[PDB]
């Protein structure tokens, strides 16, 4: 199943064919030069030696020098042009693949990790590029070499050529059966690999359990046995790998010796002089390598095309499905969660069960709970990063999923100290998507209201300073201030803040708190605060623990009573 998916891959290189033609003529001319080198070397030098070498002997070195200059030039041109085509095609493939990955659910990003994801992407792209390019160049160049060497062989005493071509099927089938016999079964030695991995793993905390049990000699004996086993397995693998090649080499020498013995038959040395037999056998020795190269590159073609297929499968699986198609721009902000039921993949215990809550506009709602609880899940669900597994939430008389994903996600802004900064200038990062729609004067006024004047003055480039640099030049407080400024500039109707990830150990936090209060004063919001002042200033507080509401009552009455809530706040 490779032809169909190679044909499907043709369009991404269809307009890129001038480089292919340039490489395809460069490689053919390269093989032609390679054959023509032997052509003008061996017979001319070994036949002009008979009282005529005075001219051809000094003629030869210039020919050799020019031929090698041509061969090197063609090699450089072909490699550079194939690299150009491969770079352009991987550029296009990476671009489309990243574009597809950006607009697809967050769960995929969760159940992979950034490092392994990007390693997969880049490594697989370069792998398919290298495999396909190598297969193409080897097929073209070595097929041209085989054709040229057969042409020269038939032009020089076709009898040896026909002997070789009739011996070819026997040698080929012998090599095929030997190679098939000498391929091992890689489905048993994994038991030893897994066993040693477990003994390292089940006996690390089990080393604590080995120390607790006191046994150290038993582990050494067990590792002795398993290491002896894996050493034996590896030695057997090396023995197979080293018994493979000499058999093929010996069969090749049987073929060459049979050809030489056929040459021993008379009536053909009459037309065969020293130069002719010399060039014929040199042609055979040169032809030795290309066939092995051809088989190995068919193998690597299959290998790389498998990776191309799995990359296509990765590109094809699902997307950001917009089943709603009921776009409602400029949402009023009627927030009310009901019948919330969702769980992480694989797990069978839902994070929330029949959770019901209301966050009316114009009122302040405080989210209080332990770190690592379901508050983060609820906040993510409010932004519809991951759709609720069960239940439905209706906003302003319409379902949350009914509204367009872009429309819903645009009306909500989340500000947190853990919001990383995009690798762009500070002015650019303040307007990550509204750079062209925001006036410079308005942005400057917002930044002045963002309490960033002290940071702007200290900046070398002021408001145009390049922020980011993998977080080396940006601090946590600066990142939080930039996030607050971005939220204020966006001025979304509903704001959900996650202060749990923030650290309270801040030297200067009063200004940040005042700025946050000013930003949240005009627009109603429900933030998960972690400060006593913010909790006290909240208009309404709902007690929810472990994704469930345990106590219901007025926030002011609960604060005045100072019961379980006060003790919990004092403890944490």
Ligand X SMILES: C[C@H](Oc1ccc2ccc(/C=C/C(=O)O)c(C3CC3)c2c1)c1c(Cl)ccc(Cl)c1F
Would you say 141 and 25 are in contact if contact means Cβ atoms under 8 Å apart?
no
Residue closer to a second copy by CB (options 74, 364) is: 74
Q: What is the DSSP string of 213-244?
A: HT--HHHHHHHHHHHHHHHHHHHHHHHHHHHH
Residue closer to a second copy by CB (options 20, 117) is: 117
Strand-pair category, 352-355 with 340-342: antiparallel
Q: Supply the minimum distance, in Å, between the C-beta of residue 257 and ligand X.
A: 10
Separation CA 11–CA 143 (nearest Å):
26
Would you say 248 and 175 are in contact if contact means Cβ atoms under 8 Å apart?
yes
**Binding residues for a second copy, total number by CB under 8 A:** 132
Q: Supply the minimum distance, in Å, between the C-beta of residue 146 and ligand X.
A: 8
E strands present in 430-530: 494-495, 526-527
Q: Which does 545 bind (CB under 5 to 8 A by kind): a second copy, ligand X, none?
A: a second copy
**Range in contact with ligand X (rule: CB under 6 A) among 288-296, 378-386, 452-460, 480-488:** 288-296
Q: Is 174 in the site for ligand X (CB under 6 A)?
A: no
Q: Which does 278 bind (CB under 5 to 8 A by kind): ligand X, a second copy, none?
A: a second copy
**Range in contact with a second copy (rule: CB under 8 A) among 2-10, 15-23, 149-157, 432-440:** 432-440
Q: Which of 21, 41, 45 is nearest to 33 (CA)?
A: 41
With CB under 6 A as the contact rule, the residue among 5, 172, 317, 556 that binds ligand X is 172
Q: Is 328 in the site for a second copy (CB under 8 A)?
A: no
Separation CA 279–CA 45 (nearest Å):
10
Q: Supply the minimum distance, in Å, between the C-beta of residue 255 and ligand X.
A: 4
Site residues (CB under 6 A) for ligand X, limited to 233-272 = 248, 252, 255-256
Q: Is 477 in the site for a second copy (CB under 8 A)?
A: no
- The angle subtended at Cα 512 by Cα 511 and Cα 513, nearest 5°, is 90
In this structure, what DSSP letter does residue 413 have?
Answer: E
With CB under 8 A as the contact rule, the residue among 17, 261, 454, 513 that binds a second copy is 261
Ramachandran area for residue 524 (φ above 0: left; ψ -120 to 50: alpha; else beta):
beta
With CB under 8 A as the contact rule, the residue among 199, 309, 339, 478 that binds a second copy is 199
Q: Is 175 in the site for ligand X (CB under 6 A)?
A: yes
**Range in contact with ligand X (rule: CB under 6 A) among 166-174, 201-209, 331-339, 507-515:** 166-174
Q: If residue 510 lies in a helix (H) or strand (E), which one and from where to where?
A: helix 510-522
Q: Is 223 exposed, middle or buried (0-12, 13-18, 19+ CB in 10 A)?
A: middle
The encoded tokens of residue 241 equal 């790998």
Residue 373's SS3 state is coil
Q: Is 292 in the site for ligand X (CB under 6 A)?
A: yes
399 DSSP β-pair partners: 394
**Range in contact with ligand X (rule: CB under 6 A) among 13-21, 85-93, 136-144, 290-298:** 290-298
Q: Is 154 in the site for ligand X (CB under 6 A)?
A: no
Residue closer to a second copy by CB (options 2, 553) is: 553
Binding mask 81-110 toward a second copy (x if CB under 8 A, else -) reads --xx--xx-xx--xx--xx--xx--x--xx
Would you say 393 and 339 are in contact if contact means Cβ atoms under 8 Å apart?
yes
With CB under 6 A as the contact rule, the residue among 85, 89, 279, 284 that binds ligand X is 284
The label of the residue with tokens 């003994």 reads: 199
Residues in contact with ligand X by the rule CB under 6 A: 164, 167-168, 171-172, 175, 248, 252, 255-256, 284, 287-288, 291-292, 295
């Amino acid at each position: 199943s490779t032809w169909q998916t190679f044909r499907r891959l043709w369009p991404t290189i269809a307009p890129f064919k001038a480089g292919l033609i340039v490489a395809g003529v460069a490689l053919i001319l390269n093989a032609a030069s390679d054959t023509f080198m032997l052509s003008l070397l061996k017979p001319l030098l070994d036949d002009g030696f008979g009282k005529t070498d005075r001219s051809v002997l000094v003629w030869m070195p210039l020919v050799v020098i020019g031929l090698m200059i041509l061969r090197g030039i063609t090699s450089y041109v072909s490699s550079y042009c194939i690299s150009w085509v491969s770079g352009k095609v991987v550029m296009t493939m990476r671009r489309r693949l990243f574009g597809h990955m950006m607009g697809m659910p967050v769960s995929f990003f969760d159940k992979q990790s950034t490092g392994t994801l990007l390693s997969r992407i880049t490594y697989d792209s370069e792998q398919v590029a290298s495999s396909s390019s190598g297969a193409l160049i080897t097929v073209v160049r070595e097929g041209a070499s085989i054709i040229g060497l057969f042409i020269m062989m038939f032009y020089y005493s076709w009898q040896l050529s026909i002997i070789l071509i009739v011996l070819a099927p026997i040698v080929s089938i012998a090599i095929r059966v030997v190679s098939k016999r000498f391929r091992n079964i890689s489905k048993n030695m994994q038991n030893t690999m897994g066993q040693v991995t477990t003994s390292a793993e089940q006996m690390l905390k089990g080393h604590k359990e080995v120390l607790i049990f006191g046994g150290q000699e038993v582990e050494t004996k067990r590792f002795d046995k398993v290491s002896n086993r894996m050493r034996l397995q590896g030695m057997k693998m090396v023995s197979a790998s080293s018994i493979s090649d000499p058999i093929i080499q010996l069969i090749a020498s049987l073929a060459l010796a049979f050809v030489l013995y056929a040459a021993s038959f008379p009536s053909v040395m009459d037309s065969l002089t020293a130069g002719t037999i010399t060039v014929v056998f040199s042609s055979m020795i040169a032809l030795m390598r290309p066939l092995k190269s051809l088989t190995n590159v068919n193998a690597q073609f299959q290998r790389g095309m498998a990776a191309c297929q799995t990359l296509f499968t990765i590109l094809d699986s699902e997307q950001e499905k917009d089943e709603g198609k009921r776009v409602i721009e400029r949402a009023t902000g009627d927030v009310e969660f009901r019948n919330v039921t969702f769980t992480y993949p694989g797990r069978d215990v839902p994070a929330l069960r029949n959770i019901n809550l209301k966050i009316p506009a114009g009122k302040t709602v405080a989210l209080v709970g332990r770190s690592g609880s379901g508050k983060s899940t609820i906040a993510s669900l409010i932004t519809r990063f991951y759709d609720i597994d069960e239940g439905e939430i209706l906003m302003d008389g319409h379902d949350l999923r009914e509204y367009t994903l872009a429309s819903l996600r645009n009306q909500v802004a989340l500000v947190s100290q853990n919001v990383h900064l995009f690798n762009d200038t500070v002015a650019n990062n303040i307007a990550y998507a509204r750079t062209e729609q925001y006036s410079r004067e308005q942005i400057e006024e917002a930044a002045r209201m963002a309490y960033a004047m002290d940071f702007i003055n200290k900046m070398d480039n002021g408001l145009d300073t390049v922020i980011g640099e993998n977080g080396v030049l940006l601090s946590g407080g600066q990142r939080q201030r930039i996030a607050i400024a971005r939220a204020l500039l966006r001025d979304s109707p509903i704001l959900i803040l996650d202060e749990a990830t923030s650290a309270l150990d801040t030297e200067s936090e009063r200004a940040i708190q005042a700025a946050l209060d000013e930003l949240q004063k005009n627009r109603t919001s429900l933030v998960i605060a972690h400060r006593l002042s913010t909790i006290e200033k909240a208009d309404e507080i709902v007690v929810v623990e472990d994704g469930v509401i345990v106590e219901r009552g007025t926030h002011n009455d609960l604060l005045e009573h100072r019961g379980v809530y006060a003790q919990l706040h004092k403890m944490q």
